[PDB]
Design an enzyme around this catalytic site. Structure first.
Site, mmCIF file in Angstrom:
data_model
loop_
_atom_site.group_PDB
_atom_site.id
_atom_site.type_symbol
_atom_site.label_atom_id
_atom_site.label_comp_id
_atom_site.label_asym_id
_atom_site.label_seq_id
_atom_site.Cartn_x
_atom_site.Cartn_y
_atom_site.Cartn_z
ATOM 1 N N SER A 180 -0.742 15.436 -12.171
ATOM 2 C CA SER A 180 -0.956 15.070 -13.560
ATOM 3 C C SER A 180 -1.229 16.323 -14.389
ATOM 4 O O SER A 180 -1.808 17.304 -13.904
ATOM 5 C CB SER A 180 -2.139 14.101 -13.659
ATOM 6 O OG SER A 180 -2.480 13.832 -15.005
ATOM 7 N N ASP A 193 0.843 -1.195 0.000
ATOM 8 C CA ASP A 193 0.000 0.000 0.000
ATOM 9 C C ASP A 193 0.880 1.247 0.000
ATOM 10 O O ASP A 193 1.354 1.675 1.058
ATOM 11 C CB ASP A 193 -0.908 -0.051 1.231
ATOM 12 C CG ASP A 193 -1.855 1.127 1.324
ATOM 13 O OD1 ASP A 193 -2.435 1.342 2.415
ATOM 14 O OD2 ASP A 193 -2.005 1.851 0.319
HETATM 15 C C1 LIG Z 1 -6.042 -0.847 1.488
HETATM 16 C C2 LIG Z 1 -6.761 -0.175 2.645
HETATM 17 C C3 LIG Z 1 -6.405 -0.850 3.961
HETATM 18 C C4 LIG Z 1 -6.467 1.321 2.723
HETATM 19 N N1 LIG Z 1 -6.922 2.066 1.528
HETATM 20 C C5 LIG Z 1 -5.904 2.727 0.686
HETATM 21 C C6 LIG Z 1 -4.885 3.548 1.470
HETATM 22 O O1 LIG Z 1 -3.732 3.764 0.654
HETATM 23 C C7 LIG Z 1 -5.425 4.888 1.989
HETATM 24 C C8 LIG Z 1 -5.552 5.921 0.860
HETATM 25 C C9 LIG Z 1 -6.237 7.196 1.292
HETATM 26 C C10 LIG Z 1 -5.501 8.338 1.581
HETATM 27 C C11 LIG Z 1 -6.133 9.504 1.985
HETATM 28 C C12 LIG Z 1 -7.506 9.543 2.103
HETATM 29 C C13 LIG Z 1 -8.249 8.416 1.818
HETATM 30 C C14 LIG Z 1 -7.619 7.249 1.414
HETATM 31 N N2 LIG Z 1 -4.568 5.410 3.047
HETATM 32 C C15 LIG Z 1 -5.042 5.657 4.280
HETATM 33 O O2 LIG Z 1 -6.203 5.560 4.610
HETATM 34 O O3 LIG Z 1 -4.044 6.051 5.098
HETATM 35 C C16 LIG Z 1 -4.391 6.296 6.490
HETATM 36 C C17 LIG Z 1 -3.103 6.228 7.291
HETATM 37 O O4 LIG Z 1 -3.332 7.112 8.394
HETATM 38 C C18 LIG Z 1 -4.052 8.222 7.890
HETATM 39 O O5 LIG Z 1 -3.182 9.258 7.460
HETATM 40 C C19 LIG Z 1 -3.118 9.226 6.033
HETATM 41 C C20 LIG Z 1 -4.473 8.763 5.592
HETATM 42 C C21 LIG Z 1 -4.855 7.743 6.676
HETATM 43 S S1 LIG Z 1 -8.438 2.676 1.547
HETATM 44 O O6 LIG Z 1 -8.309 4.095 1.647
HETATM 45 O O7 LIG Z 1 -9.147 1.961 2.560
HETATM 46 C C22 LIG Z 1 -9.198 2.352 -0.011
HETATM 47 C C23 LIG Z 1 -9.200 1.067 -0.533
HETATM 48 C C24 LIG Z 1 -9.831 0.825 -1.747
HETATM 49 C C25 LIG Z 1 -10.462 1.862 -2.456
HETATM 50 N N3 LIG Z 1 -11.070 1.626 -3.738
HETATM 51 C C26 LIG Z 1 -10.442 3.145 -1.902
HETATM 52 C C27 LIG Z 1 -9.815 3.393 -0.691
#
Ligand SMILES: CC(C)CN(C[C@@H](O)[C@H](Cc1ccccc1)NC(=O)O[C@H]1CO[C@H]2OCC[C@H]21)S(=O)(=O)c1ccc(N)cc1
Ligand code: NA
EC number: 3.4.23.22
Length: 330
Positions: A199, A35
């Protein structure tokens, strides 16, 4: 040093990708979701509440002769999809595709939310965003890539995701046979902890390219491509019968429809996402309506170049002193 590991879709629609990771001594192999949008390496474990484990492979630190509890350290994470997990922390040996890091922080889950329990194919996460986002307290820990970087032949990793097929994560080298043309590199801002870039614009199908700055994150852990509502509306307007459904939570389309490609700009270069990468199958079992792979980022707060976009490219995550991102067609 280098490493190279195959990453495999969890299902027939590429809803996520899993990569085998060796943890501990003797090795315990878990299938983790790599991730680039988060920065914690956490696993289902012998410490996870029993009712919250349903088919996942667990890490058992007491069976690893190299595991050491990190005194006083805990972690707790909440993700964009509303899921969450938390627990304590061990240091242990972690290997990916032949590349080994000793003393990696392995975050052992005591609790996971229902979405994690319900997905038997994902044994944990391996975060590859910047270490400033790591949640371990009171002492923040480093990602696998950050720990490995100085030992690598080159301080990079690459993502080469397949469409309905396995792909590859490489660490420390660029496989010049894995792409066509040249790699175009573009600036990264680390201010939010992500591989965040801009982009240069987009095109829909065979239409002309619209030059416009789209700031977003390169995120292997997000399944879909999330873009501003104006862009997404312009795409789906070219799909006969497509509509935004508030009940389903996004754009849907007749499953038999011909989807146009979507092109995004990387500097002067162009990455073309074939139409069929945008098809995520019936909205419910047996339905004639299908879920779209390009959706509005409104309410997220950020645009996300997820797997739908990244799997159309060979992507270089360049961890040089000033990080950059590279994209090539393939
Ligand atoms: C694979 C999952 C366990 C996590 N995901 C992707 C992930 O890269 C997200 C991607 C992400 C990033 C920002 C906002 C929403 C989603 N990152 C994230 O939530 O990071 C968290 C870590 O602590 C916090 O500080 C940074 C954000 C929080 S997810 O957001 O749940 C996700 C998964 C699938 C889809 N289609 C859309 C979103
Ligand atoms: Na290839």
């Amino acid at each position: 040093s280098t490493g190279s590991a195959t990453t495999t879709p969890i299902d027939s629609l590429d809803d996520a990708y899993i990569t085998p990771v060796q943890i501990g001594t003797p090795a315990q192999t878990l299938n983790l979701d790599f991730d680039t949008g988060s920065s914690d390496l956490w696993v289902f474990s012998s410490e996870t509440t029993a009712s919250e484990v349903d088919g996942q492979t667990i890490y058992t630190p007491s069976k690893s002769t190299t595991a050491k509890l990190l005194s006083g350290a805990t972690w707790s994470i909440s993700y964009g999809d509303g899921s969450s997990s938390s627990g304590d922390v061990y240091t242990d040996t972690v290997s990916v595709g032949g590349l080994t890091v000793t003393g990696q922080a392995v975050e052992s889950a005591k609790k996971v939310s229902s979405s994690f329990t319900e997905d038997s194919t994902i044994d944990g996460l391996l975060g590859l965003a910047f270490s400033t986002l790591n949640t371990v307290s009171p002492t923040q820990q480093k990602t696998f890539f950050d720990n490995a970087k100085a030992s690598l032949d080159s301080p990079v990793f690459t993502a080469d995701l397949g469409y309905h097929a396995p792909g590859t994560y490489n660490f420390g080298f660029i496989d010049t046979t894995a792409y066509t043309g040249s790699i175009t590199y573009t600036a990264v801002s680390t201010k939010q902890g992500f591989w965040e870039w801009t982009s240069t614009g987009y095109a829909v199908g065979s239409g002309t390219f619209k030059s416009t700055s789209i700031d977003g994150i390169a995120d292997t852990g997000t399944t879909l491509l999330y873009l501003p509502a104006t862009v997404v509306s312009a795409y789906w307007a070219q799909v006969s019968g497509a509509k935004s459904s508030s009940s389903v939570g996004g754009y849907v389309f007749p499953c038999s429809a011909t989807l146009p490609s979507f092109t995004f700009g990387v500097g002067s270069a162009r990455i073309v996402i074939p139409g069929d990468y945008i098809d995520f199958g019936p909205i419910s079992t047996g339905s004639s309506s299908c879920f779209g792979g390009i959706q509005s980022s409104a309410g997220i707060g950020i645009n996300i170049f997820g797997d739908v976009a990244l799997k159309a490219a060979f992507v270089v995550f360049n961890g040089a002193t000033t990080p950059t991102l590279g994209f090539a067609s393939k």
